[PDB]
Amino acid sequence: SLAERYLQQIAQSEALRIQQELNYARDVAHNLGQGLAALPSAGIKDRAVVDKMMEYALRDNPEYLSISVIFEENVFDGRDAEFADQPGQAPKGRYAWFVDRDQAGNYAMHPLLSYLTPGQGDYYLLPQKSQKDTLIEPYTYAYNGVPTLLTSVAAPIVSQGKLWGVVTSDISLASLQQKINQIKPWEGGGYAMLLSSAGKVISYPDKSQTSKAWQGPTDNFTSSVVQHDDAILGEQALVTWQPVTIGNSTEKWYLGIVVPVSQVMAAS
Amino acid sequence: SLAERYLQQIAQSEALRIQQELNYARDVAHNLGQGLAALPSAGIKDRAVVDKMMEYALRDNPEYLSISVIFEENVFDGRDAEFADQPGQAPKGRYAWFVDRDQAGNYAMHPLLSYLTPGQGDYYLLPQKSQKDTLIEPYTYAYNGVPTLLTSVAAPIVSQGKLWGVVTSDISLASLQQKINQIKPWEGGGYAMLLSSAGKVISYPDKSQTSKAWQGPTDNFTSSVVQHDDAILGEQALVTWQPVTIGNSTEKWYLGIVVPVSQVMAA
């Protein structure tokens, strides 16, 4: 049907827009990583140089929560054992650090205490093993004493067959929701929703649903158009899903478009 | 009008896909540039470090022709005078270099001899003046002795108020054409076109129009659908235009979608 193809095409356009936002974040992390891997080749072995490069990347991205960098064991300078148990360092002396902004807006380095533990540390552990770009399931981190729901857009660092580590761009769920809730897919109405790979809510007009498992209408996040009793719109709605993918990832997120049957069938 | 709106939506999706590809190149150049500007701040003043980061950016982008970096005068190391008027260097001893691949496939650094000359050097001169990301009008450079049509995706380096220079990702027009000509906007049929800001043909299914001016019926590059006799399709066709923009560029390219009227009149 012509209406349903048009609806499918709207969903495609909107998934491409949000895909551009997430790829931008992947690119910041991926391109920062390629430059960091060039440093040992050029004879630069000073971890303060990595700190400054990470700082300038965060500086250029004022809405990001932080940038995180994890090199593989010893590959940067060979000195993980010297840092191993010193105060304020990361587990086993690894170059595993992130940069964020303080309450005054100046830039601070903090060690990645979580990077070896399953769950919290998946921003490192999952892409380290797959060597694939990865949109990480939503989780929580306290920045300046404020619990914050976020995702990480993680990019393995691969060059000349060698894994150098992982770089991530750390993105608040709120900032994503700010873009998704602007989407008005049909004559200034309807709404858009965004779901993770595991089907966790990234953005839904009922913010109380954030980070929770979706328990609703999808038939395996189909591209087909399906009619549902929608609680946000309070009427019969048409729903279609489109995938969102970054870099070389094989997994995906799902953008959903929801429009009222009344305004669609009636426009005909 | 529902058919019109769908056609417009198709153009918007195809435009977004091309725009993602051009923005990937903008990002390569922009993000390298931010890393390079960090280096003096960290005490690195060795031009060989810049060489290596450029090489690693090109290595990660085997399809690109080269990556070019032009620093502003003396901003990296203050030593331009020590490199000035030596053969093998760029004009005035500037850090102005590109990296490319040999016929053997290994990486070589070459000076940007043209960075101050109007026309050939616009990849530097135009973004240095506007300080905006810029899709450079298509031009020619002899890589390894072979004239090649390319565009440069140019990203001025700005950090904490200061212009540090310009980085560019240099892309062959052939690779862009190879992507535009796979676009089949309708049922597997029709085609897509790409005009530069100046109306030069970036991509048109007749490649002999490449880089030439477009003396065709564009309606102020309107989203509005317009009907025209089309030579490529050989029938009445519907045309619609959508902008394509990178970074903070104020200028844009235009993707045109062209589909036969007979197949749109179907539904």
Residue numbers in the entry:
A (entry chain A): 18 to 285
B (entry chain B): 18 to 284
Sentences from the paper on this structure:
Chemoeffectors are sensed by chemoreceptors that in turn stimulate chemosensory pathways that modulate the activity of the flagellar motor. A canonical chemoreceptor is composed of an extracytosolic ligand-binding domain (LBD) and a cytosolic region that contains the signaling domain that interacts with other signaling proteins. The dCache domain is the predominant extracellular LBD in bacterial signal transduction systems, and it is present in about 15% of all chemoreceptors. To identify the molecular determinants for acetylcholine recognition, we report high-resolution structures of PctD-LBD (with bound acetylcholine and choline) and PacA-LBD (with bound betaine).
We also identified the PacA (ECA_RS10935) chemoreceptor of the phytopathogen Pectobacterium atrosepticum, which binds choline and betaine but fails to recognize acetylcholine. Betaine bound most tightly (KD = 7.5 μM), followed by l-carnitine and choline with KD values of 20 μM and 113 μM, respectively. Importantly, titration with 5 mM acetylcholine did not produce any change in heat, indicating an absence of binding. We crystalized the PacA-LBD and solved its 3D structure in complex with betaine to a resolution of 1.9 Å. The overall structure is highly similar to that of PctD-LBD, with a root mean square deviation of 1.6 Å for the Cα atoms in a structural alignment. A well-defined electron density was observed for betaine bound to PacA-LBD. The orientation of betaine corresponded to that of acetylcholine in PctD-LBD, which was the opposite of the orientation of choline. The coordination of the quaternary amine moiety in PacA-LBD is very similar to that of PctD-LBD and primarily involves a number of aromatic amino acids. However, the amino acids that coordinate the acetylcholine tail in PctD-LBD (Ala168, Met169, Asp171, and Ser172) are not conserved in PacA-LBD. However, comparison of the three-dimensional structures of ligand-bound PctD-LBD and PacA-LBD identified the amino acids uniquely involved in acetylcholine recognition.
